[PDB]
Design a protein around this ligand. Structure first.
Ligand SMILES: [Mg+2]
Ligand SMILES: [Mg+2]
Ligand SMILES: [Mg+2]
Ligand SMILES: [Mg+2]
Ligand SMILES: [Mg+2]
Ligand SMILES: [Mg+2]
Ligand SMILES: [Mg+2]
Ligand SMILES: [Mg+2]
Ligand SMILES: [Mg+2]
Ligand SMILES: [Mg+2]
Ligand SMILES: [Mg+2]
Ligand SMILES: [Zn+2]
Lengths: 225, 86, 60, 129, 155, 104, 43
RNA sequence: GGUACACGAAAAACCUUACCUAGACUUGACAUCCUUGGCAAAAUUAUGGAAACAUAAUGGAGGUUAACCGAGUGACAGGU
RNA sequence: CAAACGUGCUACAAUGGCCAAUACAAACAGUCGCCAGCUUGUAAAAGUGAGCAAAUCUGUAAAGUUGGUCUCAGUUCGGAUUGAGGGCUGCAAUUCGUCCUCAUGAAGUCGGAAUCACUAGUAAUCGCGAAUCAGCUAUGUCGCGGUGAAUACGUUCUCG
């Protein structure tokens, strides 16, 4: 049957909001809400070879703050800090010159246990005609060896160019989805294939967080050893 | 219904045409799309071609039609007989 | 015929009553939340990702 | 030595003040006659349900302040408030009051309306054919 | 299948006449969830009984309800279809309830005026075992007596 | 000694609760480290808004999910501040989520 | 025996006076100012 | 069918609108890429107009082209 | 629009209709808004005009209590339909907005075969608020409170 979005079910209990701002009026509540979607979508669609896992936006009456975590920031940084200025001009045009931008590219710890880059890597393999079984098995084994809990990958679509759509799942461990105290990270990606669209869904379990707080601390962002 | 202070309503394009048309003796049908304009005393004696949706049906105003709407004296849909489904 | 309707809605009309509110991400006309300028089915994606601050699930 | 009780029922608070007296209890609700405040029915006695079987001859002067609810909810609130005030003067009464269960919050409040339903528990008419 | 009888809403205390049955019949004549309206109807009808019968209203009411009170109940069992009405002894709790329920249906159908006079007339007509509620009890008793053969028959 | 501002009635409100309590704790701690008599961090009723939206795009109006958004609110009125407290007031800082309604 | 006319005519006179009066007083709003979010009065 | 029928639609006079009748347009009302300039688009007042749109006006924030205003230009844009 | 079905509203009534006085909520919402009070108006409303960016100001609670009247009738039930005069929104209300006042007063007197919901603050019922919205016979939808029941012996039958 249908399941509630795993990320959306855990909001306001253990996970904070990716955008934290208070607008003036219902007209400024819409502009400040559509603009950040453009900014986030910009970051994710293009500038992808960097493995950006999550981008949070912080705005006040007039000051916009962006916190961008990535696995390979060299592509954002560019040659002797070139691409960074370039990307800055895009962001300024989107929100407006009248404001102040404060990009804060932060390197990420524990890159594996983030559902965004894993889903992006899974999706990338499918456009390159890589066999699905091998691609999925190889990504899971590196992820499992990296030291996390169970991962569930669902890749529904016109699998392998077929004319009848299927779906393949691969669970490996205890993934208690009905439980609220678990630290489950969820992300979704669209693999654009020559034969259509492939939907890849990745559930990752990153332990148990008895914390009653909403984020308030780096999750997989933390850099352990 | 319509308030008093506001009064009546014509598009004022019809008024210029109507004033011009009353001065000119050889009056001809007025092709108007404005069904919202109310029939004003000066309209009396003229003939109009109101847009029913497809064509312009001709209505000859009299000393009596004054007050109603110019589109009220023309139809929009037509129904005259059903057909046994069975 | 969606983008042109979206563009026409952005453009100011010649009468005030000619102005309607469309969703700002997509182009859906009906079921638009004036509180957010976002239609009902865009609100799910924003609420389920944390883009909208303070939007948590409700239990009553 | 006054006594204070705080009852509640159907979202209706109550502040009942028990004052020792020997010149008839003269029950009073919000500075107005209870026979004028409440309906002329057993509810006016429902309020005396814990004050009758034990006693009212001790002539307790009643000072009721209720803010919220209808009238049955207010009556239940002062009953709980009165009984809670009764639990500060001569603790055996508690035992007998406990028996009849007149010293427990009723815990009954109106449920929340649910989507797709015409009320708390009702549901739309079903048409199969 | 249920195999469980959870707490049966138990209440009895009555004030004006100390007869639990008065509260039950009040609840029976209840309509639209109006307690005050039903209370006025019963108490005014009881007041109407003082000027007519010159006797205690509770005594006449008990004399009426006990007289209306039935003995046999005809239930439903399957046999090639339909049911050959089986007479069974209904318990006392249901027994009073059915008696009170029957009183209300025939009281709200009398040719009389305000149900005050209607129910008073219905009740006064039942203290002498000659009324509309009696006929129903008479009919079910007569229906049960004819079908005594299939009585015992139980699943 | 001076005042220059009598009866500073600071009002706090935010979509989040714990941040609001934390922010109220920091302001109160600083304002008592200087010589000011805090009236008290009292809570005001929280205005909760609820929007009911059908999840599906096309059919099944009966199955409709629901959302709520609470704007937690607090009140705090300061009697006398003076420059000696104004400096702390300035370098106090407040996490974005929390919203202030200083009314002077 | 007026047969309508006079009374509806007066309404028409009011409307024609309205139409010839028409002044382009196009506007969109009412109450104004007091629209802000405050700050720490200088941060 | 249950699991459609106060359903999509949490608001069809105009708008919405996707439909019909008409009056108008063609790298187009919107977009990028390219050779090339920016010394505007608006809004509003006139005349003809059912209104689209035309012919005339204040020639317009700004910032020297930033964004856009254009020309040239074929890949194309577009389709509820 | 000759018709048929589904979901709701209003009723066929003295557990009521009409008139007067009057007590008791919760939740939510509000600066192109909530609109107090005052003046005019048979009324919808208009003008003046404070107060409230809100536990502060505003959004009349109704059923309920008492008194008067109606006396079982197609009625002081029931409001449809129709005609006229007004008010509001909006360029614009005829196709196709709603409100008020006057005028009229269809059917309907408990509804065939057959069916639906509900196990306590539940069914029934009385109001209040919000969303989209310039305005809208939304009687719809999502919520909030006031009053507030009856029954469950049992699984033989019935559906899953
Ligand atoms: Mg489209
Ligand atoms: Mg509109
Ligand atoms: Mg289906
Ligand atoms: Mg249209
Ligand atoms: Mg210039
Ligand atoms: Mg230049
Ligand atoms: Mg006050
Ligand atoms: Mg008033
Ligand atoms: Mg009537
Ligand atoms: Mg009309
Ligand atoms: Mg159950
Ligand atoms: Zn949308």
């Amino acid at each position: 049957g249908q399941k509630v979005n795993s990320n959306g079910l855990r909001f306001g209990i253990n996970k904070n909001w990716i955008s934290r701002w208070t607008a003036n009026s219902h007209a400024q509540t819409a502009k400040w809400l559509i603009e950040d979607e453009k900014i986030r979508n910009l970051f994710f669609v293009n500038y992808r070879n960097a493995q950006v896992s999550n981008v949070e936006i912080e705005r006040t009456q007039a000051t916009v703050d962006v916190f961008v975590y990535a696995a390979q920031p060299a592509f954002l940084i560019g040659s002797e800090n070139k691409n960074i200025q370039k990307i800055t001009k895009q962001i300024k045009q989107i929100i407006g010159r009248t404001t102040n931008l404060d990009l804060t590219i932060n390197e990420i710890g524990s890159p594996m246990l983030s559902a965004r880059i894993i889903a992006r890597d899974l999706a990338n393999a499918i456009e390159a005609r890589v066999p699905l079984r091998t691609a999925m098995r190889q990504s899971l084994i590196k992820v499992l060896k990296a030291g996390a809990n169970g991962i569930k990958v669902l890749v529904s679509g016109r699998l392998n160019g077929a004319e009848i759509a299927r779906d393949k799942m691969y669970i490996e461990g205890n993934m208690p989805l009905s439980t609220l105290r678990a630290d489950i990270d969820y992300a979704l990606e669209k693999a654009q294939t020559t034969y259509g669209v492939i939907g890849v869904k990745v559930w990752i379990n990153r332990g148990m967080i008895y914390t009653k707080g909403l984020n308030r601390t780096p999750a997989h962002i933390l850099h352990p050893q | 219904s319509r308030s008093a202070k506001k009064g009546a309503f014509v598009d004022a394009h019809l008024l210029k045409k109507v004033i011009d048309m009353n001065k000119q003796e050889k009056k001809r049908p007025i092709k108007t799309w404005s069904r919202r304009s109310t029939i004003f005393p000066e309209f009396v004696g003229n003939t109009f071609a109101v847009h029913n949706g497809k064509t312009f049906i001709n209505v000859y105003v009299t000393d009596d039609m004054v007050g109603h709407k110019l589109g009220e004296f023309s139809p929009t849909r037509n129904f005259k007989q059903h057909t046994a489904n069975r | 015929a969606k983008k042109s309707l979206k563009v026409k809605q952005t453009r100011i009309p010649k009468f005030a009553v000619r102005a309607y509110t469309r969703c700002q991400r997509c182009g859906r006309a009906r079921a638009v939340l004036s509180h957010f300028g976002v239609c009902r089915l865009c609100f799910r994606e924003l609420a389920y990702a944390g883009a909208i601050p303070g939007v948590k699930k409700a239990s009553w | 030595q006054s006594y204070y009780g705080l009852g509640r029922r159907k979202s209706s608070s109550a502040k009942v003040y028990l004052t020792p007296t020997q010149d008839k209890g003269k029950i009073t609700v919000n500075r107005r006659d209870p026979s004028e405040y409440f309906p002329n029915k057993l509810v006016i006695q429902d309020m005396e349900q814990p004050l009758d079987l034990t006693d009212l001859k001790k002539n307790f002067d009643i000072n009721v302040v209720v803010k919220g609810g209808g009238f049955t909810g207010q009556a239940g609130a002062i009953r709980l408030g009165i009984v809670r005030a009764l639990l500060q003067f001569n603790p055996e009464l508690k035992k007998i009051l406990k028996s009849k269960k007149l010293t427990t919050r009723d815990k009954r409040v109106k449920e929340r309306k649910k989507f797709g339903l015409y009320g708390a528990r009702r549901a739309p008419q079903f048409t199969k054919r | 299948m249920r195999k469980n009888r959870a707490p049966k809403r138990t209440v009895l205390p009555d004030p004006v006449f100390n007869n639990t049955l008065v509260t039950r019949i009040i609840n029976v004549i209840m309509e639209d969830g109006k307690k005050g309206l039903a209370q006025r109807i019963l108490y005014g009808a009881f007041d109407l009984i003082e000027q007519r019968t010159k006797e205690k209203p509770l005594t006449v009411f008990e004399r009426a309800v006990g007289n209306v009170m039935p003995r046999l109940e005809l239930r439903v069992r399957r046999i090639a279809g339909s049911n050959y009405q089986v007479p069974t002894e209904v318990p006392q709790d249901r027994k009073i309830a059915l008696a009170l329920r029957w009183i209300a249906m025939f009281a709200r159908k009398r040719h009389e005026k305000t149900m005050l006079e209607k129910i008073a007339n219905e009740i006064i007509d039942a203290s002498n075992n000659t009324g509309a509620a009696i006929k129903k009890k008479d009919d079910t008793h007569k229906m049960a007596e004819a079908n005594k053969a299939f009585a015992h028959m139980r699943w | 000694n001076a005042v220059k501002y009598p009866e500073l009635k600071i009002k706090l409100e935010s979509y989040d609760s714990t941040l609001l309590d934390l922010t109220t704790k920091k302001i109160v701690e600083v304002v008592k480290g200087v010589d000011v008599k805090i009236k008290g961090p009292l809570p005001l009723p929280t205005k909760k808004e609820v929007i009911t939206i059908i999840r599906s795009p096309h059919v099944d109006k009966a199955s409709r999910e629901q959302f709520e958004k609470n704007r937690h609110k607090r009140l705090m009125i300061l009697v006398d501040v003076n420059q000696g407290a104004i400096d702390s007031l300035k370098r106090i800082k407040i996490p974005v989520g929390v919203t202030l309604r200083f009314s002077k | 025996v007026h047969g309508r006319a006079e009374k509806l005519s007066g309404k028409f006179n009011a409307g024609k006076a309205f139409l010839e009066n028409k002044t382009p007083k196009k506007a969109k709003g009412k109450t104004e100012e007091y629209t802000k979010h405050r700050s720490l009065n200088e941060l």
